[PDB]
């Protein structure tokens, strides 16, 4: 990533990273509002969530959110050279395959991330901040898709 984009990403992540579950909760609430057909993909204790709010009562799901936020934090930490996370991210792509999940829904998850950032940052969500994040998310997804497919 470019050296100005890198700083915008670090500075913007700071407030989010202080309360990662509260913020991931926004991300996932937004996700299920946009695309409730993703809700059945998250199954714990042999059961489907009926409503999006049901997910937010599941300690397994909230623990899932914490994992997501930890991986985003890792991409932020390595933003100036994401090749250091390449092999992890390819492994993450394989995992999405292993559980029977394809990644054509990646753009919606991305929009959900950007939504959470916009709401957290308010006026500090500049256009430059948005494009930095979209570029980081894209690079993450492209590494994940390598692992999902051959390689
Ligand atoms: C592309 C659309 C996506 C869908 C539909 C999706 C869905 C899922 C599902 C269903 C699981 C399994 C949950 C479980 O049984 O506990 C999972 C795991 C995971 N997802 Fe995603 N996901 C997507 C993209 C992403 C992206 C872009 C990230 C980036 C941080 C991410 C991070 C994770 C992590 C960290 C796990 C847990 C990995 C592990 O336990 O080893 N996902 N995802």
Author numbering: 1 to 151
Report text from the authors:
Ngb is over-expressed in hypoxic conditions and it may be involved in gas/redox sensing, radical scavenging, and/or signal transduction. The dissociation of His64 is the rate-limiting step for ligand binding and it triggers a repositioning of the heme which slides further inside a large internal cavity.
Crystal structures of unliganded hexacoordinated F106A (1.8 Å) and carbomonoxy-F106A (F106A-CO, 1.75 Å), were determined to observe the effect of removal of the steric barrier to heme sliding posed by Phe106. At this resolution, we clearly detect the double heme conformation: the B conformer (canonical, 30% in ferric F106A, 27% in F106A-CO) and the A one (reversed, 70% in ferric F106A, 73% in F106A-CO). However, the most striking observation about heme conformations is the relative position of the A and B conformers, that are laterally and vertically shifted, with their iron atoms being about 1.0 Å and 0.90 Å apart, respectively in the unliganded and in the carbomonoxy form. The enhanced displacement of B conformer is due to the absence of Phe106 ring onto which the heme leans in the WT protein. This structural feature could account for the biphasic behaviour detected in CO binding. The evaluation of the fast and slow binding phases in CO mixing experiment allows us to attribute to the B conformer the slow binding fraction and to the A conformer the fast binding one.
